[PDB]
Write a protein that binds this DNA or RNA. Structure first.
Ligand code: MG
Ligand code: MG
Ligand code: MG
Lengths: 175, 104, 84, 177, 136
RNA sequence: CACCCCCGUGCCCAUAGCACUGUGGAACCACCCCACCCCAUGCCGAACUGGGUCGUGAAACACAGCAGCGCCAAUGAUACUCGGACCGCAGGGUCCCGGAAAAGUCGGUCAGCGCGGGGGUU
RNA sequence: UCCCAAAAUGUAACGGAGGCGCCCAAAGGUCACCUCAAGACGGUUGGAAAUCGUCUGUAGAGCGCAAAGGUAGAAGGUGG
């Protein structure tokens, strides 16, 4: 992502395919303005558990994580973004997606397994090695099987910010 | 509880009064018969019973009232006002009062 | 007679003339007697030098300049930092 | 007439059972009460008297008519109207009547066997729910009106119920084991 | 459909969506692209339609309840006051909003569960999927 | 304002509140003790109140740590809008120009500032 | 008295809701004091609420009636 400008005036882009963000930490809170498409093809994967090279026009590579993007209504199109410069030993806390795997003993059974909570935020991730996903069991689950955060295995170190007993998923019944 | 001190205090008008207020912390036997000037968070006199007492404390009663009334003299105060506390103007406190309420 | 309801319920006729507000604003050389605020409960609380009528009205006892003070909302006051 | 073994049997034995940094910080007893939530089901401008007259000779204290919280729920309820009766006891009269109970009260109870264990005011405070008034060293049916009951409150500095019980028992109290 | 209890009447005005997230409760979802008044009975028209296409799972979310009473001509007159508290009930959808979002059925078994459901709405809508991560 | 701490009383009046934890005792404070009568609880000197130790610091308080919660709160982009000028039959909407939120995010703090009296620096 | 009413005031409709033609020797003057709703655990006729008790508890209560504003340092609750 080669964003270059960063003036308060976004004219020179609002037409020209280019999104407009801002990134910081507590130190520098530099103004920003990157390419629409690029970021558009970008953020997709890495989402918010994905840090990428930020060599602002002039050659000064930076590290940051996707904070908060506020896209257009009427148009799934995005307009503004927030990057939270990666730290080193602690970024803050992150939002990690819940994922199912292996056919469940509920699906075939007679019902369908539902993921009550899509993405999930956990206390402390640990910068340098931050889960860009989170596979989860479902098979065992049968006729009304709830799985909470205090169940899902954890990626060596990370601590669950979300209440444990909280239903992350549950096999839903028929009808 | 506290209410009592804030009612008593609040009821006592500040600068609309112009006058001055004399307090008292006689829930202890360490009264403080303090005198304060409305606006400025200043204290003009005072006449506790902290400088010894001889043995009295609930008795040093009118002592501190006396030790204050004549005390303002070396400042020269004429009009003052009693801002007691919870202390329901009984004897112990009436002491300081009458004592001073005449010694002034 | 008959056997119904005297008047037809659910109406919408009439209301009230009504007034109230703020008669004197920040920095107006009030006067002895000027009224500075018609309020209802105690929106603005009698500051320093501001007598307060029976209907929470607020007037000036002496002369001077009108002063507004609002601490974190809730409690507001109109004072009179007289000139002279 | 008490207090020494109060401390002694209780207090010391307490450090000699526990370990208190002071004698100040040891579970004690703040007040014993007698709630008389009678009437209502018996609106006897006459029956109300039985209680007081009574309570007072068995608690040696003129009680107050804890009039309805002005609550007027569906059934029989209304404004602030005489319903119950409160009589708080502390220190002296407390211990003075109290002792009666530890001594005569309960001991002298037909069908009596002891009192429930299970924690009450997790506040380290205990509760007592007496019924029939016919078991009092004062209660005289051959000089009363009809026959009633009553409830008593144990108010104790006890920080915990653990510390409560003991105090409660050593000080005088039977437990149905 | 209808609200359980309330006040009785109302007014009318507009400005685009404000609280119609995106993903939440599902993987697929429908969004309205025009300022309208969704008649409760035009919701049933969807729900039910949508049902049929599905058999079980019931992974259909209707996050657009009708908080709005409308009115009518008692027959003609004019000489009297406001009228017809009960013409029907409406739920004001605004652009970008999310009335629907099934979840669980095939991408396709989802693009039809709406197509139809869209043929009975006073406006134009398009389907949506993910990357929706604002508040959670 | 020599250094400190403590008690009273302010301004300020949650970025000064809470909680969890620890520090303090015989200078101050409080608990504590008795209390017939002064004066007193619509019952209880629990609270008012009168006369005082010891003992304790446990409770209350004062102090200090801490931020899990509260309270504060950016910037960037945005909602809206004065003004200018347009669109769609209509619901509605847009362009140029100044103003410009709310919520949320970075982060922020568990105050700061007086007067007077007390006791310490063996 | 609320809304309409377009953050000053004011503003219409056979527009949307609701009250008044009173009440209080004391529900007034002043002077003292107390402070609520509500839940949780534990308690006797009780057992849903209610009487007592113990925690939480800027008040989520109260204010003679309609609503709004206002109010606990009380306009709330008692006594002289
Ligand atoms: Mg302009
Ligand atoms: Mg314009
Ligand atoms: Mg603009």
């Amino acid at each position: 992502m080669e964003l270059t400008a960063k003036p308060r005036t976004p004219k020179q882009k609002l037409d020209e395919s280019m999104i407009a963000a801002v990134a910081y930490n507590k130190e520098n809170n530099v103004s920003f303005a990157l390419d629409r498409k690029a970021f558009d093809r970008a953020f997709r994967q890495q989402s918010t558990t994905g840090l990428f090279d930020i060599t602002v026009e002039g050659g000064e590579t930076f590290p940051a994580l996707v904070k908060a993007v506020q896209m257009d209504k009427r148009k799934r199109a995005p307009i503004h973004v927030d990057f939270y410069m990666v730290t080193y030993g602690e970024p803050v806390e992150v939002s990690v997606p819940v994922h199912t795997t292996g056919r469940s003993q509920g699906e075939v059974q007679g019902g369908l397994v539902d993921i009550v909570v899509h993405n999930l935020q956990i206390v402390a991730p640990g910068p340098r090695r931050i889960p860009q996903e989170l596979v989860v069991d479902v098979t065992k689950m049968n006729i009304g099987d709830h799985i909470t955060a205090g169940d899902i295995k954890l990626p060596e170190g990370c601590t669950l910010a979300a209440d444990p007993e909280l239903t992350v998923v549950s096999v839903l019944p028929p009808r | 509880r506290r209410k009592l001190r804030t009612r008593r205090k609040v009821r006592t008008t500040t600068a609309a009064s112009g006058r001055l207020r004399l307090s008292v912390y006689r829930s202890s036997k360490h009264i403080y018969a303090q005198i304060i000037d409305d606006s400025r968070g200043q204290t003009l006199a005072a006449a506790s019973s902290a400088a010894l007492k001889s043995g009295n404390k609930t008795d040093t009663a009118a002592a501190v009232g006396k030790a204050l009334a004549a005390a303002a003299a070396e400042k020269g105060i004429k009009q003052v006002v009693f801002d007691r506390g919870s202390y329901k103007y009984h004897g112990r406190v009436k002491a300081l009062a009458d004592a001073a309420r005449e010694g002034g | 007679a008959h056997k119904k309801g005297v008047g037809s319920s659910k109406n919408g006729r009439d209301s009230n003339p009504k007034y109230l507000g703020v008669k004197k604003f920040g920095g107006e050389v009030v006067k002895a007697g000027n009224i500075l605020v018609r309020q209802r409960g105690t929106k603005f609380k009698a500051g320093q030098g501001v007598g307060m009528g029976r209907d929470h009205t607020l007037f000036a006892l002496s002369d001077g300049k009108v002063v507004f003070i609002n601490k974190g909302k809730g409690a507001r006051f109109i004072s009179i930092e007289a000139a002279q | 007439q008490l207090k020494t073994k109060y401390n002694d049997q209780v207090r010391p034995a307490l450090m000699q059972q526990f370990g208190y940094s002071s004698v100040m910080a040891v579970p004690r007893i703040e007040k014993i009460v007698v709630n008389e939530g009678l009437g209502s089901s018996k609106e006897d401008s006459k029956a109300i008297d039985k209680a007081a007259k009574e309570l007072a000779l068995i608690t040696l204290q003129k009680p107050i008519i804890t009039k309805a919280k002005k609550s007027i729920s569906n059934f029989k309820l209304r404004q602030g109207m005489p319903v119950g009766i409160k009589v708080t006891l502390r220190g002296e009269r407390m211990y003075v009547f109290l002792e009666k109970l530890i001594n005569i009260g309960l001991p002298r109870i037909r069908d009596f066997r002891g009192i429930n264990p299970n924690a009450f005011d997790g506040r380290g405070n205990y509760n007592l729910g007496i019924k029939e008034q016919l078991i009092f060293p004062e209660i005289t049916y051959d000089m009363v009106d009809k026959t009633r009951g009553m409830d008593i409150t144990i108010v104790t500095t006890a920080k915990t119920d653990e510390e409560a019980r003991a105090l409660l028992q050593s000080m005088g109290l039977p437990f149905r084991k | 459909k209808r609200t359980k209890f309330r006040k009785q009447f109302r007014g009318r005005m507009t400005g685009d969506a404000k609280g119609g997230d995106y993903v939440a409760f599902g993987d697929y979802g429908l969004i309205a692209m025009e300022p309208a008044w969704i008649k409760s009975n035009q919701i049933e028209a969807c729900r039910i339609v949508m049902s049929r296409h599905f058999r079980r799972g019931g992974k259909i979310y209707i996050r657009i309840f009708p908080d709005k009473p409308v009115t009518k001509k008692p027959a003609e007159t004019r000489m009297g006051k406001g009228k017809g508290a009960v013409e029907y009930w409406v739920s004001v959808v605004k652009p970008g909003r999310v009335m629907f979002e099934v979840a669980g059925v095939t991408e396709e078994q989802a693009k039809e569960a709406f197509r139809l459901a869209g043929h009975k709405l006073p406006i134009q809508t398009k389907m949506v999927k993910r990357e929706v991560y604002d508040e959670a």
